[PDB]
Amino acid sequence: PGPPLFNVSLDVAPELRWLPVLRHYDVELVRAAVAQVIGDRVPKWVLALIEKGALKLERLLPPPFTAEIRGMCDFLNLSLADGLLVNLAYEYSAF
Amino acid sequence: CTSIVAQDSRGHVYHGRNLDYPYGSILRKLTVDVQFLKNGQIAFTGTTFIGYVGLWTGQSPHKFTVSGDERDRGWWWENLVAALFLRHSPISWLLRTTLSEAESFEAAVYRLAKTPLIADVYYIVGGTNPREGVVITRNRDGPADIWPLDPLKGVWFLVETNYDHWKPAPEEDDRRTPAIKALNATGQAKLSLETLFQVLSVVPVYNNYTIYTTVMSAASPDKYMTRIRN
Ligand SMILES: CCS(=O)(=O)c1ccccc1C(=O)N1CCN(c2nc3ccc(F)cc3s2)C[C@@H]1C
Ligand SMILES: COCCOCCOCCOc1ccc(C(C)(C)CC(C)(C)C)cc1
Ligand SMILES: COCCOCCOCCOc1ccc(C(C)(C)CC(C)(C)C)cc1
Ligand SMILES: CC(C)(C)CC(C)(C)c1ccc(OCCOCCO)cc1
Ligand SMILES: CC(C)(C)CC(C)(C)c1ccc(O)cc1
Ligand SMILES: *[C@@H]1O[C@H](CO)[C@@H](O)[C@H](O)[C@H]1NC(C)=O
Ligand SMILES: *[C@@H]1O[C@H](CO)[C@@H](O)[C@H](O)[C@H]1NC(C)=O
Ligand SMILES: [K+]
């Protein structure tokens, strides 16, 4: 039947437009899933420094790109550093 | 990854891809097809993982389809400067921005070819008219090469794995040859989303790291089909 099919309205603010989708998912499954891939690849010394520069890093990235991640993180209780790392996985050779 | 844009004997363009990455046990559960709406209407469709807002596979209905494959991503300090100092775009974010803003297959190739990026990538684009099929080998600053369909010359498909097409694939990881072999046997006459799907189901094109397979045709946007593998 293929994967789930979801609607995302680009007329809703970036922080809010992914949240109706996240309702259908176990919040703890997603958190643990992000935590596993990040912990398996990002060195612990990199994670420490990124968590301390996550707010400065967010401001230097495309606002709409980061605004959607910020909203999903608050909803999932995920750390911004974790949301940015997984969304910049391709741009980081660790992944 | 493996992306294929091809044209059949009647002038129809088909576009399919295989997304290869570890952690399939996790990501298969989080794979989703997303229809992005404007004014309540489908502006474009994409396949992604819950939590990842960029699109590596997507379709602008009746305009073009696009997929992105990994290219040598260089060093992290080059990407850092390009990202934070030069303000270049993430790869999957440009791909999704193009699906949103580009008004035609031609405009999409321009955007995907010349917009500065944080790292290298292969952009594969298909359209809704004959010959509308290219592979954009991207540098950070622009296109290293553009590779078009040429049916009258005998080039009715373009097969991109993760290596430059003007060079031979590595002996250790060659999914290009079996993909070509499977396409020649299919034939430009019998090309379709189903036969295309079977090309992408051939080993090792279909390997243990394949998470999902998508086949699409911007001219028939309702045929957009993603399937979870394994
Ligand atoms: C070129 C596309 S690719 O997926 O194969 C790839 C190859 C090498 C390095 C990075 C990436 C890449 O762009 N991604 C890989 C993993 N990813 C993930 N998204 C989530 C989302 C939730 C979660 F719990 C874990 C993950 S891992 C983001 C992106 C698709
Ligand atoms: C900065 O606002 C963007 C403009 O929005 C116009 C439409 O109204 C949407 C604003 O609503 C919110 C409310 C809260 C939030 C945050 C990120 C603070 C928390 C959240 C998303 C978990 C509710 C974001 C957007
Ligand atoms: C396997 O080889 C990779 C080695 O990984 C360890 C080296 O990492 C050191 C620096 O790590 C980072 C991580 C993120 C970043 C940001 C998010 C600021 C930018 C990015 C994603 C473009 C690299 C910069 C440096
Ligand atoms: C963020 C920077 C790049 C500005 C500063 C830091 C100190 C992190 C830096 C500075 C320089 C640097 O060079 C890498 C070695 O190049 C040799 C070619 O192989 C790497 C990192
Ligand atoms: C290069 C280094 C890993 C040492 C620092 C990094 C990217 C985590 C950083 C730190 C602060 C900041 O504002 C942006 C990036
Ligand atoms: C969310 O994370 C915060 C840490 O910032 C923690 O204090 C809180 O207990 C968490 N809540 C849930 C429901 O996980
Ligand atoms: C998405 O939106 C369209 C138009 O509003 C609607 O017809 C369709 O049923 C919606 N699909 C989902 C899964 O919400
Ligand atoms: K829930």
Side-chain angles (χ1 to χ4, degrees):
Chain A
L5 183 70
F6 288 108
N7 279 2
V8 168
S9 178
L10 299 170
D11 298 320
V12 170
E15 298 91 349
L16 299 168
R17 58 173 64 126
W18 281 100
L19 309 185
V21 176
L22 294 171
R23 193 191 73 244
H24 301 76
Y25 290 89
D26 194 327
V27 162
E28 291 299 333
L29 178 84
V30 179
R31 297 177 74 270
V34 174
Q36 194 195 315
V37 301
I38 289 180
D40 210 322
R41 291 183 172 277
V42 187
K44 295 178 177 179
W45 63 274
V46 174
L47 280 158
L49 302 168
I50 290 176
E51 286 169 4
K52 205 62 164 182
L55 291 182
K56 295 175 160 171
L57 166 66
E58 175 187 24
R59 280 188 282 267
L60 296 171
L61 252 19
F65 175 72
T66 66
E68 293 186 4
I69 303 167
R70 184 197 319 145
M72 295 183 69
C73 285
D74 289 337
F75 186 92
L76 296 174
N77 216 33
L78 209 66
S79 73
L80 190 76
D82 286 348
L84 297 174
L85 275 168
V86 75
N87 279 270
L88 296 173
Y90 185 79
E91 292 69 13
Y92 186 18
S93 56
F95 296 87
Chain B
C1 310
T2 299
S3 299
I4 296 166
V5 62
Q7 177 180 320
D8 67 8
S9 55
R10 309 159 66 197
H12 300 145
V13 181
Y14 304 94
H15 190 161
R17 75 106 83 246
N18 274 9
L19 200 293
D20 300 341
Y21 197 77
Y23 306 98
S25 61
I26 298 169
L27 299 177
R28 288 192 308 263
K29 309 179 194 156
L30 303 179
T31 299
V32 296
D33 295 324
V34 180
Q35 305 184 139
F36 296 75
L37 307 188
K38 301 185 185 184
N39 304 317
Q41 306 295 350
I42 300 178
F44 57 94
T45 301
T47 308
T48 187
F49 305 130
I50 292 295
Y52 193 81
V53 299
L55 292 176
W56 289 101
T57 311
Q59 170 184 266
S60 181
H62 299 300
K63 293 191 180 64
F64 57 94
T65 55
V66 49
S67 75
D69 302 350
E70 180 182 345
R71 192 162 186 249
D72 192 283
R73 299 177 277 154
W75 314 98
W76 61 262
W77 55 89
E78 299 181 328
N79 299 8
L80 197 165
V81 176
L84 307 187
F85 291 84
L86 299 176
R87 302 302 206 90
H88 291 186
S89 175
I91 281 62
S92 57
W93 189 246
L94 171 59
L95 198 157
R96 165 175 161 190
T97 295
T98 302
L99 286 159
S100 178
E101 297 177 7
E103 64 273 10
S104 58
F105 165 88
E106 308 94 56
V109 178
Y110 188 93
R111 284 153 169 270
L112 295 169
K114 288 182 70 62
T115 307
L117 286 170
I118 293 166
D120 298 7
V121 67
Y122 301 98
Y123 281 134
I124 301 87
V125 192
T128 61
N129 295 314
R131 304 186 301 172
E132 286 186 347
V134 296
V135 173
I136 310 169
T137 307
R138 276 300 312 264
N139 297 326
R140 288 181 184 87
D141 298 322
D145 171 81
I146 289 176
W147 183 24
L149 283 175
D150 202 355
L152 300 178
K153 185 180 142 195
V155 177
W156 58 277
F157 62 74
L158 309 170
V159 173
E160 174 57 44
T161 69
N162 295 113
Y163 310 93
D164 298 339
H165 69 91
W166 62 88
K167 275 174 284 178
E171 303 86 314
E172 320 90 42
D173 180 31
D174 180 13
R175 287 158 285 108
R176 189 200 301 176
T177 305
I180 296 169
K181 179 177 173 67
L183 280 154
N184 278 333
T186 302
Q188 176 172 356
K190 285 187 176 214
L191 181 70
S192 63
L193 294 167
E194 297 75 5
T195 58
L196 223 200
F197 184 91
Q198 293 304 327
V199 176
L200 293 164
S201 304
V202 176
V203 180
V205 178
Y206 174 20
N207 54 94
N208 282 320
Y209 292 89
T210 306
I211 293 166
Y212 68 85
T213 296
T214 304
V215 298
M216 42 184 177
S217 192
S220 301
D222 291 16
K223 312 281 185 59
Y224 193 102
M225 188 208 307
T226 302
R227 289 290 178 272
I228 313 299
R229 315 308 301 260
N230 280 318

